[PDB]
């Protein structure tokens, strides 16, 4: 199991005078931070969200983001004027993964109107191949900012893996927690004329990895349709698995659920 840290920024520029920037951080599947345009601070969502950082460290990290947010939206408005761009959706996805064998990696990807345009590579900003020409002009300006460049490297190479190591420790018990799902069957819409839709709902499990198949005893029905894994408000997950059978094929059929919290005691519901 892996717990990368992904820091996500959503900056929306409706025109030259109206803009919002909002952020959040994820460790693995769990949201640890929330960063609101209304707020003067990034909010720790968990008792362990601060990692092993000192209060004085967190505060200057708060300061860094606070000035980052201000001049980022300053700078975006400049480039939009400079490069004659029409009104704007920017997204940032930055963070890192800790691998105890030195194979530790990090990333800082920026997207414009939903498309990758540039990322941080080694030491400087680098455009992607498919990005428009004009992005080249902006990277010429960005790479003249040696302090922003030195700081981004410190955050990626230094602050981030330090932070992830502290979060893995101070949040150890919640990360390893197991919550058992419940399941229930229901009749879905008639898919055809002589057909009935068997529906197996599975809700309440954590963490995310799960296995749900319709079965006739031990014969896994290849017709099993697994839904998306959808989130509940309490950080568990929900899953719908559907089967299209003929009028009389329903009887004798069972939904099987295997999850890391059950300890081999699968859930099995017979139709």
């Amino acid at each position: 199991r892996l717990f990368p840290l992904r820091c996500l920024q959503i900056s929306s520029f409706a025109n030259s005078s109206w803009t919002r920037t909002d952020g959040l951080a994820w460790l693995g599947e769990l949201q640890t931070h929330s960063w609101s345009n209304d707020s003067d601070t990034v909010r720790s969502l968990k008792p362990w969200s601060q990692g092993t950082f000192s209060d004085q460290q967190w505060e200057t990290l708060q300061h860094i983001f606070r000035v980052y947010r201000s001049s980022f939206t300053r700078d975006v408005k400049e480039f939009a004027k400079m490069l004659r761009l029409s009104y704007l959706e920017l997204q940032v996805s930055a963070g890192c993964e800790v691998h105890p064998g030195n194979a530790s990696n990090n990333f800082f990807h920026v997207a414009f109107q939903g498309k990758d345009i540039l990322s941080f590579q080694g030491t400087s900003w680098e455009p992607t191949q498919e990005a428009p020409l004009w992005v080249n002009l902006a990277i010429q300006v960005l790479n003249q900012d040696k302090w922003t460049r030195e700081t981004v490297q410190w955050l990626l190479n230094g602050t981030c893996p330090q932070f992830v190591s502290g979060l893995l420790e101070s949040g150890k018990s919640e990360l390893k927690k197991q919550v058992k799902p419940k399941a229930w069957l229901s009749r879905g819409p008639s898919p055809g004329p002589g057909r009935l839709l068997l529906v197996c709902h599975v809700s309440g499990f954590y963490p995310k990895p799960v296995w749900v198949k319709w079965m006739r005893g031990e014969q896994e029905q290849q017709g099993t349709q697994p839904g998306d894994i959808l989130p509940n408000a309490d950080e568990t997950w929900y899953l719908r698995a559907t089967l299209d059978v003929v009028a009389g094929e329903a009887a004798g059929l069972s939904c099987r659920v295997k999850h890391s919290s059950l300890e081999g005691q699968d859930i099995v519901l017979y139709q």
């Epitope: 004085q56 460290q57 200057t60 302090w147 030195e150 700081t151 490297q153 410190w154 190479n157 230094g158 602050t159 893996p161 330090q162 190591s165």
Partner: T-cell receptor, first 108, second 111 residues
């Protein structure tokens, strides 16, 4: 960058003296170090920013002032003779820059 | 967190020199700085790194894999490189401005 006039400074015991440090570049933090022959640098006084200054491990006997951001004067008033080095600091990655140093000898 | 260096070191001219430094309690956000003080002069910045090896024109910094030790490497020492070399940690957060130096390594370069 950093100026320390003059290179050499001589004074008789029990007389007070103030060595100058003038920097032209725009650095907030300033430092005074003291070095004895064949010895390492020992920090006297540092000023993270104007009107502020904190005492290093051997400020006993020394006084300092930070009224402008381009100037940081050290004043001596037990073993005053030594090599006195002034430094400035930039932001991350926080490299230090040093004056050419002033030589101070105090005679009985 | 402090650093440790041998007191003195000798090396022949026109050979590379590996100057060692130990910093076992270093943290992920600590930079490693190296300074050089020629006789009668003020220290001079030489190089700094965080997590990757660094190459300037005359000197490189090799950082161990656990970041617990490091090496300043003069690519080719000449007589003029006789100096005291200081290996320092600099907190990347920028909290304490109590910037202090150890004793460093006095390098002698032999003809």
């Amino acid at each position: 960058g950093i100026t320390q006039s003059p290179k050499y400074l001589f004074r008789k015991e029990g007389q007070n003296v103030t060595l100058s440090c003038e920097q032209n570049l725009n650095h907030d933090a300033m430092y005074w170090y003291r070095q004895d022959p064949g010895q390492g640098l020992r920090l006297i006084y540092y000023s993270q920013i104007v009107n502020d200054f904190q005492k290093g491990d051997i400020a006993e006997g020394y006084s300092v002032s930070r009224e402008k951001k381009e100037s940081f004067p050290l004043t001596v008033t037990k073993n005053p003779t030594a090599f006195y080095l002034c430094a400035t600091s930039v932001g991350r990655p926080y490299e230090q820059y040093f004056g050419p140093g002033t030589r101070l000898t105090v005679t009985e | 967190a402090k650093t440790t260096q041998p007191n003195s070191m000798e090396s022949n001219e026109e050979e590379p020199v590996h100057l060692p430094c130990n910093h076992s309690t270093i943290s992920g956000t600590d930079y490693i700085h190296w300074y050089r003080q020629l006789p009668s002069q003020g220290p001079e910045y030489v190089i700094h790194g965080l997590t990757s090896n660094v190459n300037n024109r005359m000197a490189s910094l090799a950082i161990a894999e656990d970041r617990k030790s490091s090496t300043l490497i003069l690519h080719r020492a000449t007589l003029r490189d006789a100096a005291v070399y200081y290996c320092i940690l600099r907190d990347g957060w920028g909290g304490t401005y109590k910037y202090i130096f150890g004793t460093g390594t006095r390098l002698k370069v032999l003809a």
